[PDB]
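Heat shock 70 (HSP70) protein structure dump, as promised
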Amino acid sequence: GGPAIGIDLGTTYSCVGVWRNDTVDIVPNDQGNRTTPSYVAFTETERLIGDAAKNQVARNPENTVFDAKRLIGRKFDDQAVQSDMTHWPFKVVRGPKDKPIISVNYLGEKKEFHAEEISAMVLQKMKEISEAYLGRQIKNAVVTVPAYFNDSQRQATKDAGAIAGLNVMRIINEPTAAAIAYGLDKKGTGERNVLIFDLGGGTFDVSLLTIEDGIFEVKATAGDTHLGGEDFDNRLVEFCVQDFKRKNRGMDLTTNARALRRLRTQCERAKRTLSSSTQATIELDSLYEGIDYSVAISRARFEELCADYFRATLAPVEKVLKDAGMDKRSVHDVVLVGGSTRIPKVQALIQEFFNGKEPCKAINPDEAVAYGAAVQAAILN
Ligand SMILES: [Mg+2]
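structure tokens r here:
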């Protein structure tokens, strides 16, 4: 019998893991990456998934689909859907029974997709990278979802799994997968109160769990669906756009889709450098109109650019505690999930809020969800 895979089907990035040899192996894609963009693109001659899809986003905005997780199992007239639609370059139309229909151009014809068909292609890609890595067919999988996902959203995710040819053994909550990764369910007798602080690329989720006799109870959830790592990267982009203007007689790089994409990717990298170093250099040759660009950014400058965002990560933490009627002193574990939790200011605010309590951060924060999903998949296989 073949191994079962744990899949973190993320908003901006997807990650897959396999339990083997006393650990979880995070599956590398074609390029050797441990995470894959949740992107699908359609051209006159082909479809592209992940990296190849994200790499051409600048050239093909109308037919490059992303954020399908925000649409999955939702209805067209839903307030979150109409609001999200205003920031998507791709067309979203009303289908029969109020289902959102993604409309793109593919192979010279108009083609329509349901959000689960787009997530199915991301899952199909997660299956293919696993098959190449493990040298065999993979069908069994555990797929993760946010704890706030309703029945329709879970069912639509299960259907994306089926379309991809995966037998979805279980749909588990992302904070539960994270608790499993840290073995928080195996600490002993009595209640273990866990706070999962999940700051992803696109969404911010705080979940308060209670683990008793190995049973996971979601007591409360809160966050901001529109606060993520990309928002911090965007503040650097904005800084860099304005800095280029003053260095280059008011020239606006935002009018060139490629220049803006290039600069954004470099701001993502700089933000990552500023999580370990106190300064970063954004350097881009022939960025806009043959003009090279270079700027040095201190950690302090970056923190000042994202000041309002830092003030906002504690509000959901206070909310879950209030909603569950729990004192912060009762929290046994504070688990950090998502690359942006690497940000020193973010780590320092949480630790401070929990009166100096050290957080659970040992597991790669971009891989912790796939880690627990892989553990759960090995248990069910
Ligand atoms: Mg994400």
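The longest strand covers residues 215-224.
lmk if u need the other ones
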